[PDB]
Amino acid sequence: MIQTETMLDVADNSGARRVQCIKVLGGSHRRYASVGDIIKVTVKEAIPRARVKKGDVMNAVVVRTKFGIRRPDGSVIRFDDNAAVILNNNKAPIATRIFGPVTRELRTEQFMKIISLAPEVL
Amino acid sequence: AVQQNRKSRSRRDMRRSHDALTENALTVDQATGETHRRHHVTKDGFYRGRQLFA
Amino acid sequence: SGKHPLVQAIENSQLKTDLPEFAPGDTVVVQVKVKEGDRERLQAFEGVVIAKKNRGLNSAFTVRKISSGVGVERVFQTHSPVVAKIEVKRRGDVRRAKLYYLRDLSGKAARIREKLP
Amino acid sequence: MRHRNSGVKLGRTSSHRKAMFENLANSLFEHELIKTTLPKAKELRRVAEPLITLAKNDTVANRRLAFARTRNAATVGKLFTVLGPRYKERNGGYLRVLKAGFRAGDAAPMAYVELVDRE
Amino acid sequence: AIGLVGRKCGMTRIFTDAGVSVPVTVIEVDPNRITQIKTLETDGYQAVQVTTGERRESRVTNAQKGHFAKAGVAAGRLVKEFRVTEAELEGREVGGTIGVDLFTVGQIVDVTGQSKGKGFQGGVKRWNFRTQDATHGNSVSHRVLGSTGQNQTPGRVFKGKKMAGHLGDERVTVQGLEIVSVDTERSVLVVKGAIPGATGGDVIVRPTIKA
RNA sequence: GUACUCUGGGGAUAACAGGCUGAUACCGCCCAAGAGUUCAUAUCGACGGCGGUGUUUGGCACCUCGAUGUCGGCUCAUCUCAUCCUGGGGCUGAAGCAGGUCCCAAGGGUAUGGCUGUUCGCCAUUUAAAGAGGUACGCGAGCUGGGUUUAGAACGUCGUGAGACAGUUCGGUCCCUAUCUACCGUGGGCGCUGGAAAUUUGAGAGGAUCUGCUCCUAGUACGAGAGGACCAGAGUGGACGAACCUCUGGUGUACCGGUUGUGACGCCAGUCGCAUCGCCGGGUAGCUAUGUUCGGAAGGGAUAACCGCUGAAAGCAUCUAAGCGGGAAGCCUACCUCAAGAUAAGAUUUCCCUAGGACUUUAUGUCCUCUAAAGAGCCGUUCGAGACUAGGACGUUGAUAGGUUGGAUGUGGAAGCAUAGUGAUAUGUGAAGCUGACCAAUACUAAUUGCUCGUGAGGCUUGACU
RNA sequence: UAAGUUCCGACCUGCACGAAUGGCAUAAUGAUGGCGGCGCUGUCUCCAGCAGAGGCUCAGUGAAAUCGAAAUCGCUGUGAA
RNA sequence: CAGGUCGAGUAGACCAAGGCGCUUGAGAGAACUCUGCUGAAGGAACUAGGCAAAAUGGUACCGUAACUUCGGGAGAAGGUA
RNA sequence: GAACCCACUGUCGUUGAAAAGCCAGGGGAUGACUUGUGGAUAGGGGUGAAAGGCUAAUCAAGCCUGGUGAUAGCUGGUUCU
RNA sequence: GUGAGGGGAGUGAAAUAGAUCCUGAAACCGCAUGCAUACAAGCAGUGGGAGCACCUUCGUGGUGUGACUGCGUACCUUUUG
Ligand SMILES: NCCC[C@H](N)CC(=O)NCCC[C@H](N)CC(=O)NCCC[C@H](N)CC(=O)N[C@@H]1[C@H](O)[C@@H](OC(N)=O)[C@@H](CO)O[C@H]1NC1=N[C@@H]2C(=O)NC[C@@H](O)[C@H]2N1
Numbered sequence A: 001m002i003q004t005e006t007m008l009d010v011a012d013n014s015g016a017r018r019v020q021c022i023k024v025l026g027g028s029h030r031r032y033a034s035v036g037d038i039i040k041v042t043v044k045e046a047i048p049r050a051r052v053k054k055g056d057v058m059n060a061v062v063v064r065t066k067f068g069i070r071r072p073d074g075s076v077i078r079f080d081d082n083a084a085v086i087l088n089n090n091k092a093p094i095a096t097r098i099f100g101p102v103t104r105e106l107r108t109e110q111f112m113k114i115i116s117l118a119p120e121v122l
Numbered sequence B: 001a002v003q004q005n006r007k008s009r010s011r012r013d014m015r016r017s018h019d020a021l022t023e024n025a026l027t028v029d030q031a032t033g034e035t036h037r038r039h040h041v042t043k044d045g046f047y048r049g050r051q052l053f054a
Numbered sequence C: 001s002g003k004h005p006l007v008q009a010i011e012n013s014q015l016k017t018d019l020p021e022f023a024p025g026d027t028v029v030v031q032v033k034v035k036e037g038d039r040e041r042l043q044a045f046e047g048v049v050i051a052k053k054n055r056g057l058n059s060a061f062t063v064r065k066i067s068s069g070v071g072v073e074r075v076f077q078t079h080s081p082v083v084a085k086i087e088v089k090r091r092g093d094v095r096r097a098k099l100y101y102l103r104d105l106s107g108k109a110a111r112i113r114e115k116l117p
Numbered sequence D: 001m002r003h004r005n006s007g008v009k010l011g012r013t014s015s016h017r018k019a020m021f022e023n024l025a026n027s028l029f030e031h032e033l034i035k036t037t038l039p040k041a042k043e044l045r046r047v048a049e050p051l052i053t054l055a056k057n058d059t060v061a062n063r064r065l066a067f068a069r070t071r072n073a074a075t076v077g078k079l080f081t082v083l084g085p086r087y088k089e090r091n092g093g094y095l096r097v098l099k100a101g102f103r104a105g106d107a108a109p110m111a112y113v114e115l116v117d118r119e
Numbered sequence E: 001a002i003g004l005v006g007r008k009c010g011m012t013r014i015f016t017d018a019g020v021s022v023p024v025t026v027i028e029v030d031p032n033r034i035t036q037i038k039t040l041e042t043d044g045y046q047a048v049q050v051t052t053g054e055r056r057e058s059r060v061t062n063a064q065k066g067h068f069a070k071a072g073v074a075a076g077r078l079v080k081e082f083r084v085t086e087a088e089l090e091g092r093e094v095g096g097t098i099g100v101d102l103f104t105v106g107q108i109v110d111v112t113g114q115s116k117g118k119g120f121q122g123g124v125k126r127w128n129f130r131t132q133d134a135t136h137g138n139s140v141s142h143r144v145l146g147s148t149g150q151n152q153t154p155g156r157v158f159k160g161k162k163m164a165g166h167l168g169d170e171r172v173t174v175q176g177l178e179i180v181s182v183d184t185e186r187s188v189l190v191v192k193g194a195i196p197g198a199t200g201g202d203v204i205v206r207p208t209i210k211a
Numbered sequence F: 001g002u003a004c005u006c007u008g009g010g011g012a013u014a015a016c017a018g019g020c021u022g023a024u025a026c027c028g029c030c031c032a033a034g035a036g037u038u039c040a041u042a043u044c045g046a047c048g049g050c051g052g053u054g055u056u057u058g059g060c061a062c063c064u065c066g067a068u069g070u071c072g073g074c075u076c077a078u079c080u081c082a083u084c085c086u087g088g089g090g091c092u093g094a095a096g097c098a099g100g101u102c103c104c105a106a107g108g109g110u111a112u113g114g115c116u117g118u119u120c121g122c123c124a125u126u127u128a129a130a131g132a133g134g135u136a137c138g139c140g141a142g143c144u145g146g147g148u149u150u151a152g153a154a155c156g157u158c159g160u161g162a163g164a165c166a167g168u169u170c171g172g173u174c175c176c177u178a179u180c181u182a183c184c185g186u187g188g189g190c191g192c193u194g195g196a197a198a199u200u201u202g203a204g205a206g207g208a209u210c211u212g213c214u215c216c217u218a219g220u221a222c223g224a225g226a227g228g229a230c231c232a233g234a235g236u237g238g239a240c241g242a243a244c245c246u247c248u249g250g251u252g253u254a255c256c257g258g259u260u261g262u263g264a265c266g267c268c269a270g271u272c273g274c275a276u277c278g279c280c281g282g283g284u285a286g287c288u289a290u291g292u293u294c295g296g297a298a299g300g301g302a303u304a305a306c307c308g309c310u311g312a313a314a315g316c317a318u319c320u321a322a323g324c325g326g327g328a329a330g331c332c333u334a335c336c337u338c339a340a341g342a343u344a345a346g347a348u349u350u351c352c353c354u355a356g357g358a359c360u361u362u363a364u365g366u367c368c369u370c371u372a373a374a375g376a377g378c379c380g381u382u383c384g385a386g387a388c389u390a391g392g393a394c395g396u397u398g399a400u401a402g403g404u405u406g407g408a409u410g411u412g413g414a415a416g417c418a419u420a421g422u423g424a425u426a427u428g429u430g431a432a433g434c435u436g437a438c439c440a441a442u443a444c445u446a447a448u449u450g451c452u453c454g455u456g457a458g459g460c461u462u463g464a465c466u
Numbered sequence G: 001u002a003a004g005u006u007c008c009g010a011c012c013u014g015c016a017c018g019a020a021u022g023g024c025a026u027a028a029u030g031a032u033g034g035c036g037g038c039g040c041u042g043u044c045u046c047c048a049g050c051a052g053a054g055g056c057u058c059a060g061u062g063a064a065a066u067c068g069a070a071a072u073c074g075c076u077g078u079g080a081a
Numbered sequence H: 001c002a003g004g005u006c007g008a009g010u011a012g013a014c015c016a017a018g019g020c021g022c023u024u025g026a027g028a029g030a031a032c033u034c035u036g037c038u039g040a041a042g043g044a045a046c047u048a049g050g051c052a053a054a055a056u057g058g059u060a061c062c063g064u065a066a067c068u069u070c071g072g073g074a075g076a077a078g079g080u081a
Numbered sequence I: 001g002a003a004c005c006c007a008c009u010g011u012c013g014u015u016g017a018a019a020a021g022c023c024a025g026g027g028g029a030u031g032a033c034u035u036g037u038g039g040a041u042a043g044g045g046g047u048g049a050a051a052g053g054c055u056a057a058u059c060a061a062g063c064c065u066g067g068u069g070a071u072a073g074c075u076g077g078u079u080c081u
Numbered sequence J: 001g002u003g004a005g006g007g008g009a010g011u012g013a014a015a016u017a018g019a020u021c022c023u024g025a026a027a028c029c030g031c032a033u034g035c036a037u038a039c040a041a042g043c044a045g046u047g048g049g050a051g052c053a054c055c056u057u058c059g060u061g062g063u064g065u066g067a068c069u070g071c072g073u074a075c076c077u078u079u080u081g
Helices: A112-117 B009-016 C005-012 C100-104 D014-031 D038-054 D060-070 D073-086 E062-071 E123-127
Strands: A007-010 A016-024 A038-046 A057-064 A076-079 A083-087 B026-028 B035-037 C027-036 C039-053 C060-067 C070-077 C083-090 D033-037 D095-102 D109-115 E004-015 E021-028 E032-038 E047-052 E078-083 E108-114 E117-121 E165-168 E171-183 E188-192 E202-207
Touching (some): A016 A083, A038 A083, C005 E021, D033 D038, D038 D060, E004 E047
Antiparallel strands (some): A038 A057
């Protein structure tokens, strides 16, 4: 349940450490973004000498939320943090490693690389 | 906020047309033969063939 | 049994008849059925039971674990067919029904003492 | 809305309400016949009758529970000596609430509360 | 269309074999007894009138007692009509009964009920009005209506202006629900989702009109 | 000089809003040099001409100075169409995808932030789109009070000075319990051709009306390539709305437990009062969204622009004059809710009342006597119904409420007594004790004896059948 | 800062700074003016539940400002507009 | 003048001696208003402005920068029991 | 940092409990401090760490009584046929 | 209620001269009788006009009411209005 001004950790090695959501994409007046939704972010902290830098405006996909997601049997899965993965201008991941578990909502053709790189899919 | 014109006696009485009082439900008690308020103990302490105060 | 008898009768025909006895503070392994296309498999979810709701067919229990440095909790619905099997690996010694205080502890501070017969 | 809710307010805080109903129960157990307002009389059943139900078995734990609820040693003694044996075979309904007209000072509806086998 | 009158018993869930949890509402159906058939010749329209439940004779009036005795059926707790067509009228006669077997598993139905009563309610809850600031100098206007009109032109409040008033306790129809189970031995309909009203209320189940 | 100010007056006379007008403003049309490789009119269009609207800047001084008291924001709106998106078309310097221009169309929809008191504007990032206007430049007896425009103080500047400003800066009281109209809800009365209990028809009224992306047709038609469709299907979302509480959560000051200080119950033990529910951890029902489900689907009829068929006036041609068609998110239906105070007061089923005297005002006539129906209400136990009402259930031939018994749930190892320890404490008895609102049984308690209202076959005229 | 009419530093064509109507600075101090950050949060997205006091009903007491008189509707037009 | 238990205290919580329950009550538990408690995910996106709320908070020890009129800054910050 | 003396912010109150307050925060608190009693300064005068502040709920000239029935080219009103 | 207040009795020419007591107007507020009034839009009247009730010199009469209907935006002041 991510909205504008929300801070997110970065679950990859693109170089950013903390990002801030500045827009939820996908419709007029849309309020929240969940796992698998695309957001616009600004980079608040980054690794020195990395490709991405502080103050960059990029696209990202949300991979973990504290609000959690629902499953068809009525269960809910909740994580301890809100995390995102950086994407390029074509909305494709631009990292080579994934940190922490992700969920099966990412099993699409767009985000199959995250699934294949993640240490755990639950 | 306050009226611009004084209200007529006719309109005042028309408003009061709903102020009439009604009657209570009174019944005669079989044990004593006295009038009492229905479902209530009588003023002498009797109800439904029982006595409260010796 | 706070519902009408007809509702109770409808719920009773779906109850599982082989669940083990487990309590908050235990560590359990839950086998979840994962269906991909037509590929069926079983995935293990192992962790500490921090909450348990006993409501007949509406029973549930919450399991918390640490995965690659990230804490994750899942609220399993006890009688759902998705939960294939529940194993109790170790019995814990706690003083309360709900263990939400474990969410603010890490590593050594979050250790649960074993219940000794 | 107050859908399916139980309990009363009577223009009092919760602690004041609890103390008032405690006092009413003690007075009723002492005198076996009291006069009060109708809402207080009707709510007094839910407080007084479980005490009589508890007093049917004379144990140390039951006496201590009764003392915690009433804070009156004479009330505890009377409950466990007279009232409980009296109602040992009666399945509830130890009180009797009867409408008793209205009060002069404020026109408040009144009622009598009586023990079932007073005399 | 011809339907059924039932009573809402409460909500529960059904687990499918794949593990999906389906939220469902249970409807008890005392088999509806036909009390009168209305035709074009005598009434000017075609309907089937039914009754269901029970009622004690001290509460059944003499007129209703005669009405039930003409049909030859026991008095019910309610009487209700269904508008029907000539094809639907086939096989239905006064004194017959209609059961849960009128519906089949998987059929799409509409369910009508009487929604819960919320009493006197304000703009925020009744019409989703926005509240004004809780701070920044706002005096006593947090949940009030605000402006209700324009000015000298037109110098009045238009009809249909949204204001505070009674909310709930109204007839509501929910369309497009799916029949999950038809239990004939228990005389029960299990439908998917939520239906209007409180537990114990009277509901009407009809075949969907969005066909 | 007065902003430290005061009195008598004026809407005879200014600032706001209204009014008249329309120079100005905005919009449209006529002619057409020319531009467009040729070619005025695909798209522009000089020099000139004719109008429309009532948004702008103005002109006038008709209303208000025994007061019409506000720039912007907030909340809530309603209308217009000169249409921003979505829908339907003609032309094109329209291959396709796109675009340009004009016509029809007002059903719905139509951003969040940084800066500034701002409206505006610039910028960042979205969206199908972020339309133009009227409504006292809508809305302050609905909120605010940042700007302007009292009294304090300072700077630049002007003045000898009191003081002042095509200026700036720090600070600086927002009253009113709603009579009438209007509006949102909810009742009382009477009427409706004897009375009553139910079920109903629908004259009509309101609600709703939005849209993205992916796949497929098909890398097909088209195109040198680059690119890339119409039409027609499937799936999955955004915003909006309703209902609901099975699931996920919040709350849950009458449920359970831990614990600090103090006082008390004679003392230990065990408890209770007060300290925000003392604080802290949980939590049943109910309520609730951030949770769950559902909706705007499909189809008829008349049309708008536009496209016709046949066809003369006018031997040809021609959608039109006779005659016959197609055609839109728009209209009437269709979907949901309300609806006979629809005084035109409608329909159907069933139920109730069939007695005697006197008199004159010989009449649905006035007094007597006898009758009191079917039902309705008062009262009581109450409710998932409720401000009061109204509405629903029940009143002993009874489960309506409380209690009682059982179950379930929550909290979690009661008290007492035993052990083991110097002791704090731990263990056993035993998942014990306690458990608001839940489920099911159960007349123990309370719904008692009752009363009031509502009558006695329902005028006359004509017609059709008896 | 993603985006800065405010802020900080600098530039000097200062409409119209300038040396006791003092000039330029200055540690400490200020319920003094402006700008930024951490923590924090119902300020807000967007409100929900609960407690007390009113509101509402009943019994008692019992005001107010205003007021030519009222059998005190909508729309379009008219008309001291 | 002014006691007790904790306490630096005449602060504070609960009590003593000694005084009071404040001269309308009884019900109900709608909108709306006032005063409080709690709140999923987010955390100033609110707004003229973090207004208001939330937050910090004790004792002992450790440790503490630029600047400085050498006094300060300083309880800086931060940490342990 | 209490008493005591003040009055920076906010909600409430505005026919108030009150013709200037309550509540939650806030400043000083051995000094240019706060305070009792009794005195002195009197209206173009007094007093003023200076706001035209204060001088009995009254201040760019206090209050009371007289001149006095001030004057008003202004507004209102002006009674039977 | 040994209250207040009243009904009789008695006094007096008169007690509706009975104590805040001669006369007892109007605004304003009750009770009783007659007629009208719950499908109809506005300065409330005016010119017509049916019916009803009582009275009666029996009518071409008197009193009260007024279904239905044409017309009809108070008064004063100040003003071009
Ligand atoms: N001969 C006729 C003479 C006529 C007489 N002039 C009429 C008159 O003057 N009326 C005055 C009305 C004032 C007050 N409303 C009276 C009342 O109604 N009191 C109710 C009490 C009645 C009860 N039954 C007796 C009771 O509990 N007593 C206690 C007790 O003695 C004691 O406590 C302990 N723990 O022992 C004491 C503490 O010191 O407190 C007393 N309680 C108290 N409550 C009183 C309060 O608040 N204020 C005044 C004073 O009375 C206080 N004391």
